[PDB]
């Protein structure tokens, strides 16, 4: 029982931490570049209108 529970806990921990690391980073990356692109596009828009 001890062995089984230890394995289960370790597996759960590893899977969760790695999935979060894998996904959230790309999510943040995309969020950041979308922010940056918006910032750039506003300057382009203002210059165009003038």
């Amino acid at each position: 029982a001890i062995r089984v529970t230890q394995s289960d806990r370790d597996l759960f921990k590893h899977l969760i931490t790695e999935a979060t690391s894998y996904v959230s980073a790309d999510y943040m990356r995309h969020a950041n570049e979308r922010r940056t692109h918006l910032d750039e596009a506003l300057a382009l828009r203002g210059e165009l209108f003038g």
């Binding site: 001890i2 806990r9 597996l11 969760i16 790695e18 999935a19 894998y22 995309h30």
Partner: protein, 98 residues
């Protein structure tokens, strides 16, 4: 993570994928979802895969008292159970010795 740049995010995501490859080789459909998730043209796939991961660990719950379906929640209960089991093991080994 907001502070860092795209390069570090990509590198650590690659490292996380490397860990996942090991952690997922056993599964077939989940492994397939992981493989599909890598297309840059459909980032949403990644999230889909993440959902599956939860939708997997949810079913790996053992018994009623660990039915904190939130996988992150079950960890503490499991650790408590390990400690408890340590004590019961001590008692049982003493019994066996006597």
């Amino acid at each position: 993570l907001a502070y860092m740049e795209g390069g570090a995010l990509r590198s650590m995501s690659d490292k996380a994928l490397g860990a996942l490859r090991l952690a997922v080789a056993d599964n077939e459909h989940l492994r397939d979802a992981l493989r599909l998730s890598e297309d840059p043209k459909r980032p949403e796939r990644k999230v889909q895969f993440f959902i599956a991961v939860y939708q997997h660990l949810r079913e790996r719950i053992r018994q009623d008292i660990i039915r904190t379906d939130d996988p992150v929640d079950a960890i503490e209960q499991m650790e408590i159970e390990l400690a408890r089991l340590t004590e019961e093991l001590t008692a049982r080994e003493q019994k066996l010795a006597i």
